[PDB]
């Protein structure tokens, strides 16, 4: 009776951790704006880095979601 | 000549000759403040002792009313 | 340092057996002045001085008490 | 009454009568708040 | 037990808090002389520096509060500093005194802004170049800000001074509780206590200055 | 009226020399000191002074005060003295200046 | 504001010192011509 | 600064009070330890 | 019963994760302000990036809200 | 009751999502200060952006508060 | 009996959200420092913006505290 | 006894919210370092701003502590 | 039966701590973008530094995740 | 029974609060790196400012450890 | 029984606090990248500061973990 309740609470607590990837994506794209406003001829490589940075920051977020879906469903 | 300053006058009637009026106590406190001030503060080339003595009397006063709380923290019982 | 002892050897020493009669005479003088009530001659300056010396010897008694219970703060038990 | 209002109220009159009027209104407000707090307690 | 230092002190049954609140001005002796002792010299230099700092940003109507704001900063700073001595009772740890300091001054400034200035007083709730579809929202925000300014003043003083004192007391207890145990750790905790004491001196002065500066800004926004 | 040049000769910033001179006749040079130590030991032996956390906050603030005084005392004294000397010099200069002006006239 | 500007210098003096230092580090095959080409000869009245 | 040959009365009073203090301290220590142990045991 | 209680608690916890979206949006638009002040000729393209950045960071926050409505109303 | 208790706790949790909007408003106005120190001749345009940024960041925050109320009062 | 417990927990949770305003005020005044070190000729206007930013960022924190009290004392 | 338990839990939760002031004070003094490295001749005025910033950001965190104590001792 | 519930909720809490590594990776790669836009000829060494910083931030995040998995499975 | 349980939970929640101290130390020393790369001749003043900022962040963490210990020991 | 459960929950709550060290290490190494792109001749001293930063920030995070383990096993 208490396991499913704790599973809901743990799933919420786990999905809290997406705030980090949200903030990291904000930082990555703000830095893209700034670094492109400085030296726009690099616009390709800059953007490349952004994507990489994005895909890594969001990666952490997914881990959190993973644990959420590991707690909520797989257990 | 019963205006003798205390520390010179041995009598209890002197105690009742003083002006124990509100204005009298005000004058007494003000005269004490000005005696201290002129002796210790109101000099050129003055020292910080004229302030640390006031702060020591202040700390003694602060401990005096803080004793009702500390006497429950005594580490012996007798 | 050593100046402390320079003063203590004259002041902070016990009374030699030769000057206990002086102390007895002084005690007799004091009890006589208390008997005849002559202490009304003592200005409050000297009264305060005598009170401070009596307080000092009482503090001597209390230091002797803390050295006789082996513990400074209160009673160890 | 004498030598008090000569050393207390003659110097502080320009401020108590002219400058701090809004402070006096606000102090009435503060007293009202404190009365409502102590009364509901 | 823990908040014993914030309880209204009483000596022989009388409210010693009255004496403790009246004492700070006694440490500021004044003189009619032209060249006077070191205490008054240093204090007059400090008061002149403080007046020039706090009051240069105001117009001729806000500069009529020079006496009020300098008195406020001197009173609060001396009370906070005297609260650092051993066993002392600090009246700025009390929400009552801080509310009675904050509400009159803030209310006086806002009433001064609503008596004259009324067009600009009502215009201040909206920033200059605010876009149109956001004009309602930024009026609900700014308004409540103007209504929390007094409380957020008093609390900011109280919650700070109190907290500081609490922390120090707790660390003190630590040292005592560690006096009968490893002495190097006792000395490390004592060094933490010394750093905290210096920080508390700084915070006393900073809190005086910040209370006065926020009152000064509320006055500047209404003159 | 001119001020004196020195204060009241306090010792350790707490006790004036008048007390030591007043106990010099009856109890000598160590008299005040044995009175002080006796009073301290009687206070903290009969638990008139209760040792608590305030003892260590007191030691901390007293150490900070003594260090701050010994360190920034010379500087503050010299600062006040230089303030007064600059004001006096400016005043004497401005007096001689008006004397010279009226002599020129 | 660099350290030399706080000390009252200018960018002309900064440049002078830096150019003289770059000249002193030249191998002697170029050094004489370098110090001749950039040497000052004007005098102030 | 020259010392002061203190009054023999004050001196004798000092040391007699000190010795009486040693006596009283030991006496009350022995008077109080049993009652203290008794109370600490009865408090359990 | 206990399960709807935990559903409320977990929905609130999951909603906490919108703080990252708020912070990232703040960073993106602050960097837009700065990069437009620095190179005002690039404004248009800069704004483009800002939009992208915004649309990405908020997206993370949206996932959080989704999990909230996945707990409070769906499962 | 246990459902109302969890309503309280879930609203208190969902209210944490306003930290993001607070930090984002801080970032947007700090960047307004920096961008105005750089190019003070765009004070209008910049400020427009600033409010826009604010209006968006707080927006997310409001959602959280809204969600909180819709756990405390709606259901 | 249990609802007051949940009121305490929900008030603590709701007041967690003042961290965002702490961080936002930090950002606002740090950027005031930086932008004034860059262009000390705008010291007034810059400072004005800071106050605005502060007064807005802190606002969100009070929101959180508001909810805290509205869970702890009203309902 | 559940009320004292929830008092402890809510006090810990309320105490969480001082991370914001820690981070914001880091921001304020880092920006002091930067702005002073750029214009050291302004060391005085810059430092003043830092103080102000500190005293405000710290303020928010103490508000959290206030609630903590309000929950822990004053119910 | 309360131990399993506590393990679920504690694992959710433990995995909250990944938001820090998310935001830190975002910061590292945004600063990589900015530092490459300024000095595009130090690209290899700037990327080496970015790899190091991302490795350490991800290390903290994985410490949080492994504490979560230690609670959830290995007690 | 339940009171010691809540004491442990509250102690954990209160020690959450030094995350802000960690983040603020990161910000202070990153800004020290930046400001020293800018003006490498003010190394001593910049390091002293960094030490001051670090001390103040640690004080904001001490204000959380205080409530942690007031929960754990002096209820 | 309930004590061990709250020990699990409290260790999870306490290890939430490594997010601050993650974000701080991210900030330190991002600022290292930036300051080295500006002044690549200070590559050594800069790195030293970065090391020092990574030594302090992480310390805070480690403290959290210590507390967590102290709740889980020792006290
Ligand atoms: C307003 C409330 C304040 C509350 C305090 C809260 C905490 C604050 C702590 C901060 C401390 C920092 C202070 C530094 C600045 C002080 C300036 C200073 O000392 O100038 C003295 C200066 C020089 O006097 P001096 O005694 O000839 O110089 C001493 C030398 O420094 C050489 O000194 P010395 O070695 O000759 O002195 C010996 C030694 C004493 O010897 C010991 O070590 C004994 C210690 C045992 C005592 C227990 O020093 C002491 O006097 C320590 C006594 C401390 C006892 C305090 C009891 C409580 O005198 C003045 O300028 C007088 C006026 C100063 C202006 C004050 C500024 C305004 C004040 C506003 C309100 C008051
Ligand atoms: C001995 C303690 C002094 C108490 C009386 C103080 C006094 O009347 O001096 C006048 C004293 C001298 O003022 P002054 O003419 O500005 O130097 O007046 C005051 O300080 C204002 C009254 C303060 C009340 C302190 C309460 C404790």
UniProtKB/Swiss-Prot annotation, chains A, I, J, K, L, M, N, O:
Membrane topology: Multi-pass membrane protein
Biological processes, Gene Ontology terms: proton motive force-driven ATP synthesis; proton transmembrane transport
TM region(s), chain numbering: 16-36, 51-71
Gene Ontology CC: mitochondrial inner membrane; mitochondrion; proton-transporting ATP synthase complex; proton-transporting two-sector ATPase complex, proton-transporting domain
Reactions catalysed according to its record: H(+)(in) = H(+)(out)
Main location: mitochondrion
Entry's Gene Ontology molecular function annotations: lipid binding; proton channel activity
PTM: Trimethylated by ATPSCKMT at Lys-43. Methylation is required for proper incorporation of the C subunit into the ATP synthase complex and mitochondrial respiration.
Modified sites of kind N6,N6,N6-trimethyllysine: 43
Reversibly protonated during proton transport (site feature) positions: 58
Subcellular location: Mitochondrion membrane
Signal peptide interval: none
Keywords of the record: CF(0), Hydrogen ion transport, Ion transport, Lipid-binding, Membrane, Methylation, Mitochondrion, Transit peptide, Transmembrane, Transmembrane helix, Transport
Misc note: There are three genes which encode the mitochondrial ATP synthase proteolipid and they specify precursors with different import sequences but identical mature proteins. Is the major protein stored in the storage bodies of animals or humans affected with ceroid lipofuscinosis (Batten disease).
Family per record: Belongs to the ATPase C chain family.
Protein name from the UniProt record: ATP synthase F(0) complex subunit C1, mitochondrial
Organism this protein belongs to: Homo sapiens (Human)
Gene responsible for this protein: ATP5MC1
Curated annotation (Swiss-Prot), chain D:
Recorded superkingdom: Eukaryota
Transmembrane segments: 21-38
Main location group: mitochondrion
Membrane-related topology note: Single-pass membrane protein
GO biological process: proton motive force-driven ATP synthesis
Keywords tagged on the record: Membrane, Mitochondrion, Transmembrane, Transmembrane helix
Cell location: Mitochondrion membrane
Function of the protein: Subunit j, of the mitochondrial membrane ATP synthase complex (F(1)F(0) ATP synthase or Complex V) that produces ATP from ADP in the presence of a proton gradient across the membrane which is generated by electron transport complexes of the respiratory chain. ATP synthase complex consist of a soluble F(1) head domain - the catalytic core - and a membrane F(1) domain - the membrane proton channel. These two domains are linked by a central stalk rotating inside the F(1) region and a stationary peripheral stalk.
SUBUNIT field: Component of the ATP synthase complex composed at least of ATP5F1A/subunit alpha, ATP5F1B/subunit beta, ATP5MC1/subunit c (homooctomer), MT-ATP6/subunit a, MT-ATP8/subunit 8, ATP5ME/subunit e, ATP5MF/subunit f, ATP5MG/subunit g, ATP5MK/subunit k, ATP5MJ/subunit j, ATP5F1C/subunit gamma, ATP5F1D/subunit delta, ATP5F1E/subunit epsilon, ATP5PF/subunit F6, ATP5PB/subunit b, ATP5PD/subunit d, ATP5PO/subunit OSCP.
Protein name: ATP synthase F(0) complex subunit j, mitochondrial
Swiss-Prot record, chain G:
InterPro entries for this protein: ATP_synth_F1_esu_mt, ATP_synth_F1_esu_sf_mt
Tissue-by-tissue expression: Ubiquitous.
Residue list for modification N6-succinyllysine: 20, 31, 36
Compartment list: Mitochondrion; Mitochondrion inner membrane
Superkingdom, natural source: Eukaryota
GO molecular function: hydrolase activity; proton-transporting ATP synthase activity, rotational mechanism
GO BP: any one term: proton motive force-driven ATP synthesis
Cellular component terms per the entry's GO annotation: mitochondrial inner membrane; mitochondrial matrix; mitochondrion; proton-transporting ATP synthase complex
N6-acetyllysine: residues bearing it: 20, 31, 36, 43
Keyword annotations: Acetylation, ATP synthesis, CF(1), Disease variant, Hydrogen ion transport, Hydrolase, Ion transport, Membrane, Mitochondrion, Mitochondrion inner membrane, Primary mitochondrial disease, Transport
One Pfam short name: ATP-synt_Eps
Transmembrane stretches, start-end: none
Record keyword NAD present: no
CDD domains: F1-ATPase_epsilon
Disease: Mitochondrial complex V deficiency, nuclear type 3: A mitochondrial disorder with heterogeneous clinical manifestations including dysmorphic features, psychomotor retardation, hypotonia, growth retardation, cardiomyopathy, enlarged liver, hypoplastic kidneys and elevated lactate levels in urine, plasma and cerebrospinal fluid.
Similarity-based family: Belongs to the eukaryotic ATPase epsilon family.
Listed PANTHER family: ATP SYNTHASE EPSILON CHAIN, MITOCHONDRIAL (PTHR12448), ATP SYNTHASE SUBUNIT EPSILON, MITOCHONDRIAL (PTHR12448:SF0)
Protein name per Swiss-Prot or TrEMBL: ATP synthase F(1) complex subunit epsilon, mitochondrial
Source organism (scientific name): Homo sapiens
Name of the gene this protein is made from: ATP5F1E
UniProtKB/Swiss-Prot annotation, chain H:
Primary site of residence: mitochondrion
Post-translational modification N6-acetyllysine, affected residues: 33
Gene Ontology biological process terms, A to Z: proton motive force-driven ATP synthesis; proton motive force-driven mitochondrial ATP synthesis
GO cellular component, one term: mitochondrion
Subcellular locations according to the entry: Mitochondrion; Mitochondrion inner membrane
Function: Subunit e, of the mitochondrial membrane ATP synthase complex (F(1)F(0) ATP synthase or Complex V) that produces ATP from ADP in the presence of a proton gradient across the membrane which is generated by electron transport complexes of the respiratory chain. ATP synthase complex consist of a soluble F(1) head domain - the catalytic core - and a membrane F(1) domain - the membrane proton channel. These two domains are linked by a central stalk rotating inside the F(1) region and a stationary peripheral stalk.
Name of the featured protein: ATP synthase F(0) complex subunit e, mitochondrial
Annotated organism of origin: Homo sapiens (Human)
Lineage: Eukaryota, Metazoa, Chordata, Craniata, Vertebrata
Whole-protein residues included: 2 to 45 of 69
């Amino acid at each position: 009776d208490i396991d499913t309740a704790a599973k809901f609470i743990g799933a919420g607590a786990a999905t809290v951790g997406v705030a980090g990837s949200g903030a990291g994506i904000g930082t990555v794209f703000g830095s893209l704006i700034i670094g492109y406003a400085r030296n726009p001829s690099l616009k390709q490589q800059l953007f490349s880095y952004a994507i990489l940075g994005f895909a890594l920051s969001e990666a952490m977020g997914l881990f959190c979601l993973m644990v959420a879906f590991l707690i909520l469903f797989a257990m | 000549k019963k205006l003798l300053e205390v520390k010179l006058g041995e009598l209890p009637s002197w105690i009742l000759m003083r002006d124990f009026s509100p204005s009298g106590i005000f004058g007494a406190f003000q005269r004490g403040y000005y005696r201290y001030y002129n002796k210790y503060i109101n000099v050129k080339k003055g020292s910080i002792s004229g302030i640390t003595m006031v702060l020591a009397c202040y700390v003694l006063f602060s401990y005096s009313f803080s004793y009702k709380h500390l006497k429950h923290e005594r580490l012996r019982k007798y | 340092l050593a100046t402390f002892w320079y003063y203590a050897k004259v002041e902070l020493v016990p009374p030699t057996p030769a000057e206990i009669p002086r102390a007895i005479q002084s005690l007799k003088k004091i009890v006589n002045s208390a008997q005849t009530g002559s202490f009304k001659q003592l200005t409050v300056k000297e009264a305060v001085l005598n009170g401070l010396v009596a307080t000092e010897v009482l503090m001597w008694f209390y230091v002797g008490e803390i050295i006789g219970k082996r513990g400074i703060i209160g009673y160890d038990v | 009454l004498q030598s008090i209002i000569k050393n207390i109220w003659i110097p502080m009159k320009p401020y108590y009568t002219k400058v701090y009027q809004e402070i006096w209104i606000g102090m009435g407000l503060m007293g009202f708040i404190v009365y409502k707090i102590r009364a509901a307690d | 037990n823990l908040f014993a230092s914030f309880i209204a002190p009483t000596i022989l049954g009388l409210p010693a808090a009255v004496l403790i609140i009246l004492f700070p001005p006694l440490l500021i002796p004044t003189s009619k002389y032209l060249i006077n002792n070191r205490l008054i010299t240093t204090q007059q230099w400090l008061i002149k520096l403080t007046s020039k700092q706090m009051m240069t940003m105001h117009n001729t109507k806000g500069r009529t509060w020079s006496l009020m704001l300098v008195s406020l900063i001197i009173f609060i700073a001396t009370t906070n500093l005297l609260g650092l001595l051993p066993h002392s009772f600090t009246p700025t740890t009390q929400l009552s005194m801080n509310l009675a300091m904050a509400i009159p001054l803030w209310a006086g400034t806002v009433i001064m802004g609503f008596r004259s200035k009324i067009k600009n007083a009502l215009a201040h709730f909206l920033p200059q170049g605010t876009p149109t579809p956001l004009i309602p929202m930024l009026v609900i925000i700014e308004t409540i800000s103007l209504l929390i300014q007094p409380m957020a003043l008093a609390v900011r003083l109280t919650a700070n001074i109190t907290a500081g004192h609490l922390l120090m007391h707790l660390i003190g207890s630590a040292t005592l509780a560690m006096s009968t145990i490893n002495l190097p750790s006792t000395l490390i905790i004592f060094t933490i206590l010394i750093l905290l004491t210096i920080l508390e001196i700084a915070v006393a002065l900073i809190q005086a200055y910040v209370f006065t500066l926020l009152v000064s800004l509320y006055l500047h926004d209404n003159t | 009226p001119p001020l004196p040049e020195y204060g009241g000769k306090v010792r350790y910033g707490l006790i004036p020399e008048e007390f030591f001179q007043f106990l010099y006749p009856k109890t000598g040079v160590t008299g005040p000191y044995v009175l002080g130590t006796g009073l301290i030991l009687y206070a903290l032996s009969k638990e008139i002074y209760v040792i608590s956390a305030e003892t260590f906050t007191a030691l901390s603030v007293l150490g900070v005060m003594v260090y701050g005084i010994k360190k920034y005392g010379p500087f503050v004294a010299d600062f006040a003295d230089k303030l007064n000397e600059q004001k006096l010099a400016q005043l004497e200069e401005a007096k001689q200046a008006s004397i010279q002006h009226i002599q020129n006239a | 504001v660099a350290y030399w500007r706080q000390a009252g210098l200018s960018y002309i003096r900064y440049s002078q010192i830096c150019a003289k230092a770059v000249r002193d580090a030249l191998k002697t095959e170029f050094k004489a011509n370098a110090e001749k080409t950039s040497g000052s000869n004007v005098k102030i009245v | 600064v020259p010392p002061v040959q203190v009054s023999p009365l004050i001196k004798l009073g000092r040391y007699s009070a000190l010795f009486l203090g040693v006596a009283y301290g030991a006496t009350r220590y022995n008077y109080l330890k049993p009652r203290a142990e008794e109370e600490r045991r009865i408090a359990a």
